[PDB]
Design a binder for this molecule. Structure first.
Ligand SMILES: Nc1nc2c(ncn2[C@@H]2O[C@H](COP(=O)(O)OP(=O)(O)OP(O)(O)=S)[C@@H](O)[C@H]2O)c(=O)[nH]1
Ligand SMILES: [Mg+2]
Lengths: 141, 177
């Protein structure tokens, strides 16, 4: 059922899309075809310049995935040159003091960490996002 | 209100999180619990000005040297902290923490903070540094360190007794107004 929506999404992602990890190694759609979708929601990604990008966040095992709308299809997020696929391995989450609808995500990696700021539609949604990610990281090997 | 961002740095276990928590909540934390990244905020009036103060706790451990800078962008004022009862943390102010702040955020006010003030007089703590062949940090040593790193103020405070705690943060705002 959740795997049903997962498959439908995968088919709406463009074939040649990709994003670059901090270690220079490139992550492509083909690698996503194996995965289990845990959660999916529309959020906003805050840029370093204070802008908000419309994002579709997909919590999987074993990663977290950010997508943008390219008309009818989806693409990996290209925001502030950050990787749009986050490994759950050493991922943590904190709440934004400035806004209760927002959460910080810091992904430790092999080429060094990276920080993300995500705003949801409510404090309940933020709270749900945090413990959901918290539990995915817990059960991620 | 006027948004002002303050980042707290310093060696590990110098008292940053307690210093931060004690100010915003008036409660001392329970257990130690080393920090990796924590964000706090507090609304205070300084010189009749309403300020939305953003506080960014950092990890004092070396293992997070790559992580710490992620909280530095758009900082308005820095708080470099050493412990008045750990001369090693005092030496890391010029060795690690001022060069790091300087490298990432040049031309950004710095306040050098003296933490754990109540332990410099606590005799039960003074002798424990004698055995290690160490002596607590005096005021003049810190004020000399402050003008060395070009800091605006040198302030001493204690998170446990809250002596001088409200001064450290009032002065941090005035360095921004
Ligand atoms: N006596 C006294 N002890 C303090 C004071 N502030 C902190 N401590 C003690 O020192 C220890 C470390 O304080 P803490 O706030 O956790 O440092 P930290 O900078 O956050 O350490 P880290 O997270 O970077 S590793 C704690 O066990 C705490 O109880 C103080 O003002 N007086
Ligand atoms: Mg801490």
């Amino acid at each position: 059922e959740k795997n049903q929506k997962w498959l439908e999404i995968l088919n709406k992602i463009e074939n040649k899309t990709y994003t670059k990890l901090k270690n220079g190694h490139v992550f492509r759609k083909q690698a996503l075809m194996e995965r289990t979708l845990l959660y999916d929601g529309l959020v906003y990604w805050k840029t370093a310049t204070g802008r908000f990008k419309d994002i579709l966040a997909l919590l999987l095992t074993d990663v977290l995935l950010f997508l943008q709308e390219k008309d009818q299809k989806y693409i990996f997020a290209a925001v502030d040159q950050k990787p749009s696929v986050i490994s759950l391995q050493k991922l943590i989450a904190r709440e934004v003091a400035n806004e209760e609808r927002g959460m910080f995500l810091i992904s430790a990696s092999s080429a060094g960490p990276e920080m993300y700021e995500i705003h949801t539609n409510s404090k309940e949604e933020r709270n749900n996002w945090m413990r959901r990610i918290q539990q995915a990281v817990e059960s991620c090997p | 209100p006027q948004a002002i961002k303050c980042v707290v740095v310093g060696d590990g276990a110098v008292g940053k999180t307690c210093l931060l928590i004690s100010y915003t909540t008036n409660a001392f934390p329970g257990e130690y619990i080393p920090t990796v990244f924590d964000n706090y905020s507090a609304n205070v009036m300084v010189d009749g000005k309403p300020v939305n103060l953003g506080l960014w706790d950092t990890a004092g451990q070396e293992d997070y040297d790559r992580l710490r800078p992620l909280s530095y962008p758009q900082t308005d004022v820095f708080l470099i902290c050493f412990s008045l009862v750990s001369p090693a943390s005092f030496e890391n102010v010029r060795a690690k923490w001022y060069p790091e702040v300087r490298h990432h955020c040049p031309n950004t006010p710095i306040i050098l903070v003296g933490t754990k003030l109540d332990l410099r007089d606590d005799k039960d703590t003074i002798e424990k540094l004698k055995e290690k062949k160490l002596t607590p940090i005096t005021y003049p040593q810190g004020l000399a360190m402050a003008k060395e790193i070009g800091a605006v103020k040198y302030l001493e405070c204690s998170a446990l007794t809250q002596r001088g705690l409200k001064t450290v943060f009032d002065e941090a705002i005035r360095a921004v107004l």
